[PDB]
Every structure is written in C-alpha cells, then in structure tokens.
DNA sequence: CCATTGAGAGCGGCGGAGCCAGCAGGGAGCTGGGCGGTTAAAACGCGGGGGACAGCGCGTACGTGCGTTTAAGCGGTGCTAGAGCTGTCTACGACCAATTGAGCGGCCTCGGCACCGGGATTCTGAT
DNA sequence: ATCAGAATCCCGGTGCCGAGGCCGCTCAATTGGTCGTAGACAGCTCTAGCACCGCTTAAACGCACGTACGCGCTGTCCCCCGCGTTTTAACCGCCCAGCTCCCTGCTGGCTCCGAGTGGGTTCTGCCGCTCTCAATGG
C-alpha cells in the first residue's frame, strides 16, 4: 500500500508553534500542502533561472536568497530573508 | 538531522533531495535546503497563524478551507502572492457594492 | 617375586499402461451498487414594480489654433569605471556504502462539531 | 418613527464519524569518506557609459474661444422580481451484480505385468582402538 509522502506533520508541528490550542481538517491540510509544494516550485524555479542567467552550475542559498525577493511582496519577503539568513546561520554554527 | 542544527521543524532532508532531483540545477549547495526549507516554514507560519485567527473569530477550534481563504483574501501581502490561486471550498470574502444597497 | 608390554581378540565405529489425489483456473449464491418509488429543487404560472432605455436639454470641459517658451535631439570631445575576459588553487559538491530512526499506513477511541427544535433578536414593509 | 411580523441568529441538547494519536516497520536520511571541478578571486584591458557644451528647432506650454459631449431629468414600457403550483431530479427502499462459492480439468503417484521345472555360480562388513594374557626383561 504505497507509502505517498506530504508536509502534513510539519505543518501540525509549526501549527502548535503558532496556535497550541487549535487543530485542522484533512481539507485544509491538502490547502497547506498544496501551498507547500506551489511555493517550493515558483522559488526553486526562479532559482533555476538565475543559475542559467548568470551561468554558473549551483544554486546557493543565495540565489534560493533573491529568488524569494523576486517571489515575494515587500514585508513577506522581507521577513522571509531573515529566517532565512537565520537558521542558515544557526545551521552553520553547529555541524 | 539538519532540521534541528537549524532550529527548523521543516524536514531540512526531504528539501536537499527535492531540489536535486527536480532539476532545478547540475550541483545544489548546502546552505539552500536550509535557507528554503525556512522561507516555506516562515510562510506557512504566517498562514496557520491567520487562519488560526480567523477559526477563533468564527468560533471553532478546527481550521477549515474557509479559514485559510479568509486568512488569505484579508492579508493584503499574502492575497497577492495566492493572486492566481483557487482554494478549493474558500468561498469567497462578503462584499455588497453600495449602489446595490437599499436606499 | 616383580612388571612394562607385544600379541590376542573383541567391540565401537563407517518399462508401460491405467486409476484416484491435488491443484488451478472460470462462472453466478449473498452483501454492495444500480434501478424503482418518494420527495425537493427546478420549470413554470401569475402579475406588478422599478429599472432599462430613449428623448431632451443645460452647462461646461476639452479640442483646436496661435503665439510664446522651453529643452529635446544632434554629434563632437573628453574621462575612467566597470564589465568581460583571463589565469591559478582549492573548497565544496557529487557520488558510494553501511547504519540508523524519521515518517508513513494502519489502527482505534473519542470529542469538535454537524444537526436541530425552541426562544431570542433584528430587521422589513405596512401603516 | 411605530407597529407587528418575518426570517435569522444563538442556544442547549444529542450523536456520530474523522481527527489526532500510537503501534511498529522500513527506506529515506545521515554518516564517513574520496575526487575533481565550478567558481572564487586577484590581475588586466578595453568597451560604452556618463558628462558636458552649443547650434538648431521641433516640441511643449499657456491662453482664447465655442462646440458638442458629459450628465441630470424625465417619462414610459416590460423585463425580473417575489409568491406560489406542478414537473422533474435527488434521496430512500427494493432488485440485480461483484465479491464470492462451486465445478471441471490436468498431472503426479502407485500398482501390475502366465504357469510350472532343472541345473549352475556367486555372495554371510572391514578397521582399528582399548582390555586382557602370560611371555619374558631386571
């Protein structure tokens, strides 16, 4: 019985971070699924091009980096830099 | 992991495997499974959040579609990036033009 | 009388034809899914109100023209910033293998919430 | 406004099925490790981007005038509204079909294969490791 893999945990995980006290429906949990993987596509993407564009072979977390501030609106992307800027960081620190 | 050396909850692993074989490019660095696994936790942080929200405004404890699609239509900044995005079972904002009103 | 030990001898091992049994492969029972009966959304009937649309007229803003005014476009010269091409060294990624638990499906019980019948309110139209 | 009067909301009771949780297996992730190359970085040159000027004039600005269009008003006529009845499409009970219960068919296994008779020749496990005897060394 085939083992299809989601973000389904991951987003409850992140959801207690946010609501403790709140829950959600199989529904909303393909919505939140969905969303993952459109988001995951239109960076990764964008990422894809800029790799091309500038030709060179790798994509950095810089260009994951500016392809979030072409995907992205002013505050959301704002924000976005950071926690990644962040926890590349705090991944760098330990090893 | 990896999710933990970064303090994230976003499978770190699952993301390095996905850019690679999606082919996104020939090589993909290390930092980049990190940084975006991030930006989609930072993301859909902020939809949990609002929706949240919205499943305590409408008086539930369990989020629905219609949640996230209010969570989604009222956010100025998120609307716009879900700007080409149907939700199944949203609905949509309630909305009545004033020359539409009684008089 | 004393005594280790060869030799004697004994036991532990080292073709062919024809019935029934077993199995595997392909139809139409009783629990699921498709048709009949009942019943809720749609098509139709009825008729009146207000919105569409057409006509008209007023008031004025926007098109036109001219004279005045401003700065675009031209090509011509001079300066260096920065792109693009180059050249070396090495860090970081891919790739292989071997070990380990994170994540998924399968599981059951339990409670958030769909359901509702009654009473609480918040309007709509009539007066 | 002030009225009743709908229709809608909010509330307390009940009820059921999907949430959210745990059980345990497995496969994707992680670890340790080698190899080489993409791209970092420092060096170098050579394009075109910026700057700045003045001769020329085409374009832009500003104002004057009135024309014909924006829109505000009216006035009529009918197209859709809301309230209601009947036909039809969707939800509950029965009948027929898929999941299921039965036979039909190939192949492996087992048994049998004439009476009697004479003679013949070959064939009853073989090595070897310990216990016992009484010969024979001191």
Same mark, same amino acid.
């Given at each position: 019985?085939?083992?299809?893999?989601?973000?389904?945990?991951?987003?409850?995980?992140?959801?207690?971070?946010?609501?403790?006290?709140?829950?959600?429906?199989?529904?909303?949990?393909?919505?939140?699924?969905?969303?993952?993987?459109? +988001?995951?596509?239109?960076?990764? =993407? *964008?990422?894809?091009?800029? &790799?091309?564009?500038?030709?060179?072979?790798?994509? /950095?977390?810089?260009?994951?980096?500016?392809? +979030?501030?072409?995907?992205?609106? =002013? *505050?959301?992307?704002?924000? &976005?830099?950071?926690?990644?800027?962040?926890?590349? /960081?705090?991944?760098?620190?330990?090893? | 992991?990896?999710?933990?050396?970064?303090?994230?909850?976003?499978?770190?692993?699952?993301?390095?495997?996905?850019?690679?074989?999606?082919?996104?490019?020939?090589?993909?660095?290390?930092?980049?499974?990190?940084?975006?696994?991030?930006?989609?936790?930072?993301?859909?942080?902020?939809?949990?959040?609002?929706?949240?929200?919205?499943?305590?405004?409408?008086?539930?404890?369990?989020?629905?579609?219609?949640?996230?699609?209010?969570?989604?239509?009222?956010?100025?900044?998120?609307?716009?990036?879900?700007?080409?995005?149907?939700?199944?079972?949203?609905?949509?904002?309630?909305?009545?033009?004033?020359?539409?009103?009684?008089?």
């Amino acid at each position: 019985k085939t083992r299809k893999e989601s973000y389904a945990i991951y987003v409850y995980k992140v959801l207690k971070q946010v609501h403790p006290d709140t829950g959600i429906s199989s529904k909303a949990m393909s919505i939140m699924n969905s969303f993952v993987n459109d +988001v995951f596509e239109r960076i990764a =993407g *964008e990422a894809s091009r800029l &790799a091309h564009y500038n030709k060179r072979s790798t994509i /950095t977390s810089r260009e994951i980096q500016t392809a +979030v501030r072409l995907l992205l609106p =002013g *505050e959301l992307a704002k924000h &976005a830099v950071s926690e990644g800027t962040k926890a590349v /960081t705090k991944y760098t620190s330990a090893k | 992991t990896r999710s933990s050396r970064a303090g994230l909850q976003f499978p770190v692993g699952r993301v390095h495997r996905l850019l690679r074989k999606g082919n996104y490019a020939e090589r993909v660095g290390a930092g980049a499974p990190v940084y975006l696994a991030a930006v989609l936790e930072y993301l859909t942080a902020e939809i949990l959040e609002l929706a949240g929200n919205a499943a305590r405004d409408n008086k539930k404890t369990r989020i629905i579609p219609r949640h996230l699609q209010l969570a989604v239509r009222n956010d100025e900044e998120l609307n716009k990036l879900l700007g080409r995005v149907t939700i199944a079972q949203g609905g949509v904002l309630p909305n009545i033009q004033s020359v539409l009103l009684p008089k």
